[PDB]
C-alpha cells in the first residue's frame, strides 16, 4: 500500500523573474553588472531577486503634487512639487510609509 505524488511544481530562477519594485539594473564600464535601489538610493552588486516556486495542482495616475518628467538627455524622473524634491523612483511604486512609533511624550501603559 501507498500512493504516488501528484505534485506539479514550477521553479523559476532569479533572473528569469523581474526585478523587485524600485530597482534598476546597470553595467560598469567593464560590463560588470550591478543594481540600483531607488527605494533607498543605494547600489550593490548583489541581485535582489529570489527564485520562485509555484505549485500548479489542487501604471495609473500620479499622486497629488507629483510629476513625471524627462531631462534634456532624455532620462525619465519624478518631481515632488509639494517638497521641491526629485526622485528616480515612480511615486506609484512606493509602498505605504513607515508609521513612526508613538511619541516618547505620549500617554501609555506599562507592561515591562
Ligand atoms: Ca531611465
Ligand atoms: Ca538611471
Give the residue extent of every domain in the chain. 8-58, 59-95
Nearest to 98 by CA among 48, 50, 40, 47: 40
Are 8-58 and 59-95 the same fold in CATH?
yes
Experimental method: X-ray
Judged by its nearest atom, the ligand closest to the C-alpha of residue 70 is: 1
Check if the beta carbon of residue 35 is closer than 8 Å to that of residue 41: no
Quote the distance between the C-alpha of residue 55 and its chain's center: 24
The ligand minimizing its distance to the Cα of 78 is: 1
Task: Give the span between the Cα atoms of 47 and 25, in whole angstroms.
Answer: 9
State the CB neighbour count (10 A cutoff) for residue 68: 12
From 80, 76, 86, select the one nearest 62 (Cα to Cα).
80
Q: Does domain 8-58 have CATH number 3.30.2400.10?
A: no
Does domain 59-95 sit in CATH 3.40.309.10? no
Contact status, residue 68 vs residue 78, Cβ threshold 8 Å: yes
β-strands 42-44, 33-37 pairing: antiparallel
Phi and psi based region of residue 16 (left: phi greater than 0; alpha: psi -120 to 50; beta: remaining): alpha
H helix runs in the chain, sequence order:
none
Ligand number with the minimum distance to the CA of 73: 1
Instruction: State the resolution, in angstroms.
Output: 3.1
45 C-alpha vs ligand 1 centroid, how far in Å?
A: 19
Amino acid at each position: 500500500h501507498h500512493h504516488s505524488s501528484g505534485l506539479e511544481v514550477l521553479f523559476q530562477g532569479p533572473g528569469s523573474v523581474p526585478l523587485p519594485a524600485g530597482w534598476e539594473m546597470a553595467k560598469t564600464s567593464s560590463g560588470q553588472r550591478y543594481f540600483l535601489n531607488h527605494n533607498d538610493q543605494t547600489t550593490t552588486w548583489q541581485d535582489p531577486r529570489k527564485a520562485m516556486l509555484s505549485q500548479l495542482n489542487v501604471s495609473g495616475p500620479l499622486p497629488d503634487g507629483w510629476e513625471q518628467a524627462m531631462t534634456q538627455d532624455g532620462e525619465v524622473y519624478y518631481i515632488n512639487h509639494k517638497n521641491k524634491t526629485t526622485s528616480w523612483l515612480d511615486p506609484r511604486d512606493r509602498p505605504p510609509p513607515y508609521v513612526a512609533p508613538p511619541s516618547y511624550e505620549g500617554p501609555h501603559r506599562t507592561l515591562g
